């Protein structure tokens, strides 16, 4: 618990931890900062997101290595170790989801913060769904879908089609459709419509905003190239 460290110090240390590539530390500092109870600024939300995407990204890559070895194998060691990594990953996803539920989402009133947190909620339920096999796997998938859908509804009402958070949300929801929901046609249609509506709005942007939006558009096009 980071309860004895100042909020501003936790934020400063999270930035240092990023520079040092100490992502577990970075996540613990940002968890501490959230638990101070104040809303997060745009920059602080990004730090929270980057910390946990790196932590869970390493766990997911490890889980995929071990899952592949285990599939080829079919002693208990490979399964046991895959299970250990899986439980650790589930614990990190549950931690992030807990921060969003207590109480980041309910205090997020602006569209930019609310969309950001709901996209996170969809992503972390998606990572749970990647490893799920039991009685609640359908419910996990629906929890991801519901979070992404609420984020999409807000983003289409409140943000321009080139907004980078709106674009990244659509990208990740399209990956959800393709990889989790077994809806490749929905994934392709979402990615295409998102790309085209962004293209048509680029003329409104400054040079710096243009760079930000076109970077994510390229990720949409990369997926469309792979899927079609």
């Amino acid at each position: 618990a980071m309860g004895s460290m100042e909020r501003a110090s936790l934020i400063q240390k999270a930035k240092l931890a990023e520079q040092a590539e100490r992502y577990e530390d970075m996540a613990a500092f940002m968890k501490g900062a959230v638990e101070k109870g104040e809303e997060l600024s745009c920059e602080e939300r990004n730090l929270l997101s980057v910390a946990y995407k790196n932590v869970v990204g390493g766990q997911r890559a490890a889980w995929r290595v071990l899952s592949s070895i285990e599939q080829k194998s079919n002693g208990p060691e490979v399964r046991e170790y895959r299970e250990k990594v899986e439980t650790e990953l589930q614990g990190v996803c549950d931690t992030v989801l807990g921060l969003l539920d207590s109480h980041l989402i309910k205090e997020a009133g602006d569209a930019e913060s609310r969309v950001f947190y709901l996209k996170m909620k969809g992503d972390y339920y998606r990572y749970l769904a990647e490893v799920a096999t039991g009685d609640d796997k359908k419910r996990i998938i629906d929890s991801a879908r519901s979070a992404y859908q609420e984020a999409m509804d807000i983003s289409k009402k409140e943000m321009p089609p080139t907004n980078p958070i709106r674009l990244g949300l659509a990208l990740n929801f399209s990956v959800f459709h393709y990889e989790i929901a077994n809806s490749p046609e929905e994934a392709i249609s979402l990615a295409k419509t998102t790309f085209d509506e962004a293209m048509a709005d680029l003329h409104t942007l400054s040079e710096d905003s243009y760079k930000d939006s076109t970077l994510i558009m390229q990720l949409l096009r990369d997926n469309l190239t792979l899927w079609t």
């Binding site: 930035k15 990023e18 997101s49 980057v50 995407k53 990244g168 990720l219 990369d222």
Partner: peptide, 8 residues
């Protein structure tokens, strides 16, 4: 690929 999201 999803958003890499690994660098602030």
């Amino acid at each position: 690929g999803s958003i890499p999201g690994r660098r602030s």
